[PDB]
Every structure is written in structure tokens, then in C-alpha cells.
Ligand binder design. Structure first.
Ligand SMILES: [Zn+2]
Length: 363
């Protein structure tokens, strides 16, 4: 017998629209997400143009309302210039994202006092996520303490990063975090097959000592998220290859593979993949939704996946067992074998529903 899960939530996806549409658009990557069992996504702002002001937010909102097959929320991105400007639109976004590593020209921040400015100005009741690596995690965690608010750490990938987040929680601090599936299943010993051109993720894949620390500290991980960062194989193979892994399709397969192996339970999965995203980001229920998946179908991961324009994947040749069966969204039927049945534009900004409104008390 098969099993029906809730509509699952992926809170870190790069969707390339606008300004990278040959890599993926909303329609392409919302489709990749349903063929992987995700019904709500959170879009990062490092598009071109970057989503760093109300006009670019409104532009992304209109492009996404007409192209998203599942539901979605959009991230504002913190810049050197926009601290204190975003108060009008802060509630429409998934939250504010801080790019504290790998300096995009227009998402770069010059100093920690600039990080302070955002933690002050952004309304202390809406989410804040952080692209922080290594000691930067300690640094952003400090600005959170000073400004007496929560912070969400992105793409945790190192033994010291996760250990640092565990000590921050056991001391009671309001910090949450996420782990990407490449850092959970691949390592340095998978880098001879993937080479250097397509082995590009930030943060880089680490050691099996790193991967084992993530699995041993599963109770610190709040959420899984893909870091679905799709490029073409022509781009990753060349001179300046952008880091980032296409993974909205690959994700729920491997996480389901592990559950059969004991590695973690199933309420272990839905807590990281549905309940906590709803919790942390004040996201709402998607009434009359669910995902049927099989739990014995043994397969191998292909050379690429059906729907994502990426047209490759570094999980090529991993034997999994678990497959997306059906996906159905708000009274209608979205995914059934090899094809998707909801059209570009069926999805909606969850922040424009009222139960997606983030609770706030007037102080
Ligand atoms: Zn990312």
C-alpha cells in the first residue's frame, strides 16, 4: 500500500525568472517541483534584476502569478542601499534574505553594521534568512541577539556550522536552519565522478565527516530545502561556472530512500519538509492538497530529470527507492505519471491569502 503526505514546502529555490529564463522559468521550475512532490516554494531574490525593492517585487509577483504551477512566496533581498525602505512591502514577501557570502554585486554588504541596519529596520516579526558560511554564522547570530530577534541559517553544510547551531539552540537562542540534500548524500568522494565543472555548489560539498555530522545532528535541522539553483550544462561546463544544483526533482526521492533505511522516520520527514516551514515562515494551510508516493519502487536517478530546464543532475547514478505518484492542489489534480496537469498560472502568492498573513501584534 501507498502513503499520502501533506502538500510539502520547499523554502529555498532559485527560479531564474526574471533574467535567466533559459536556465529555468517559474513554469519550468514549478513543474520540476510538482514531479518532486512540493506544492509551495519560496523564491530567492538573486534574479536579474534582483528583488531588492517594491517595483522588482511587484514585477516578480506578476511574472509568478502568470507562470507558477504551485503556490509560492517571494523573497526580498537585502542590499547595501535598501535598509529601511522596504517597510511598505515587507509583509508581501516570504521574508528578507541576507547574502553574507559570495558577493553578488548588488546583494553584497560592506560591513556587519550594515547587517545590523537590516535587523533593526525590517519588522522584527517577519522572517530573515542568511547566506552565511563558517564563522559568518557566528557573526549573523550575534546581530540577531543584539536586535533581539530570530534568524534562519541557509544551506548548513559543515560539521562546525551545525555544531554551532546546536549550541545556540541548547542555550535557548531563537535560531532555525536548513540543510540541502546534496550536503546530505554526496561528499568529497563523489567529486571524481562530478568533476570540478559540475561539482560547483556553494557551500561546496564537504567530507563524509561533515555529512555524518549533519545526519548525527538531525534534531538540529529544522527544514530541508533544495537550493534548487539550475543552470544549463553548457554554463556549468565552461570557464566561470555558476555554483548550484538542480534538485527540486531529486530531493523527495532521496529523503524517501533514507526513510526506508531507518536513517530517519517519516514524521521526521514531514516535520522538516512541511510542518516547520509552515511554522517558521507563518505560511498557511493549502486546503484540499496532498501527495501520494510509493515507498518500494527501486530506481536509478537518470542523466537528467524530466521537467527542470537544468537538463542534468549530480545525483546521476544513485540507486534510490521512492517515487512521486500523484500531486493534487486545492481541489484539482496536478501531477500524474511523467506529466503535469496544472497550467502556467494556477499557483498564487500565499501572502495574498489571509491565513498566509504573518501574525503581528501592535506594540
Ligand atoms: Zn542558494
Amino acid at each position: 500500500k501507498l502513503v499520502r503526505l501533506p502538500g510539502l514546502i520547499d523554502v529555498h529555490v532559485h527560479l531564474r525568472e526574471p533574467g535567466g529564463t533559459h536556465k529555468e522559468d517559474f513554469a519550468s521550475g514549478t513543474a520540476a517541483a510538482l514531479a518532486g512532490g512540493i506544492t509551495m516554494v519560496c523564491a530567492m531574490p538573486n534574479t536579474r534584476p534582483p528583488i531588492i525593492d517594491a517595483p522588482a517585487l511587484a514585477l516578480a509577483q506578476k511574472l509568478a502569478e502568470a507562470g507558477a504551477r504551485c503556490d509560492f512566496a517571494l523573497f526580498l533581498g537585502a542590499s547595501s542601499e535598501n535598509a529601511g525602505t522596504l517597510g511598505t512591502v515587507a509583509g508581501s514577501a516570504a521574508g528578507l534574505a541576507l547574502y553574507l557570502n559570495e558577493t553578488f554585486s548588488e546583494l553584497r554588504l560592506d560591513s556587519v553594521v550594515q547587517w545590523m541596519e537590516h535587523f533593526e529596520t525590517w519588522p522584527s516579526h517577519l522572517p530573515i534568512v542568511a547566506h552565511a558560511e563558517q564563522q559568518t554564522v557566528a557573526a549573523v547570530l550575534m546581530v540577531a541577539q543584539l536586535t533581539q530577534r530570530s534568524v534562519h541559517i541557509c544551506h548548513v553544510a559543515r560539521k562546525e556550522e551545525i555544531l554551532l547551531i546546536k549550541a545556540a539552540k541548547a542555550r535557548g537562542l531563537p535560531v532555525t536552519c536548513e540543510v540541502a540534500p546534496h550536503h546530505l548524500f554526496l561528499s568529497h568522494d563523489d567529486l571524481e565522478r562530478l568533476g570540478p565543472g559540475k561539482g560547483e555548489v556553494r557551500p561546496e560539498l564537504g567530507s563524509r565527516q561533515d555529512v555524518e555530522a549533519l545526519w548525527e545532528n538531525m534534531a538540529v535541522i529544522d527544514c530541508f530545502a533544495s537550493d534548487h539553483a539550475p543552470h544549463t550544462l553548457e554554463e556549468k561546463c565552461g570557464s566561470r561556472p555558476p555554483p548550484g544544483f538542480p534538485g527540486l526533482e531529486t530531493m523527495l526521492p532521496l529523503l524517501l530512500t533514507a526513510v526506508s533505511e531507518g536513517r530517519l522516520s517519516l514524521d521526521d520527514l514531514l516535520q522538516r519538509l512541511h510542518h516547520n516551514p509552515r511554522r517558521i515562515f507563518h505560511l498557511p494551510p493549502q486546503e484540499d492538497t496532498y501527495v501520494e508516493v510509493d515507498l518500494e519502487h527501486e530506481w536509478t536517478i537518470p542523466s537528467h530529470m524530466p521537467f527542470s530546464k537544468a537538463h542534468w543532475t549530480p545525483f546521476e547514478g544513485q540507486k534510490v527507492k521512492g517515487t512521486v505518484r500523484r500531486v493534487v492542489l486545492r481541489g484539482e489534480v496536478a501531477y500524474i505519471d511523467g506529466q503535469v496537469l496544472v497550467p502556467p498560472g494556477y499557483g498564487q502568492d500565499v501572502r495574498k491569502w489571509p491565513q498566509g498573513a504573518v501574525p503581528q501584534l501592535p506594540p
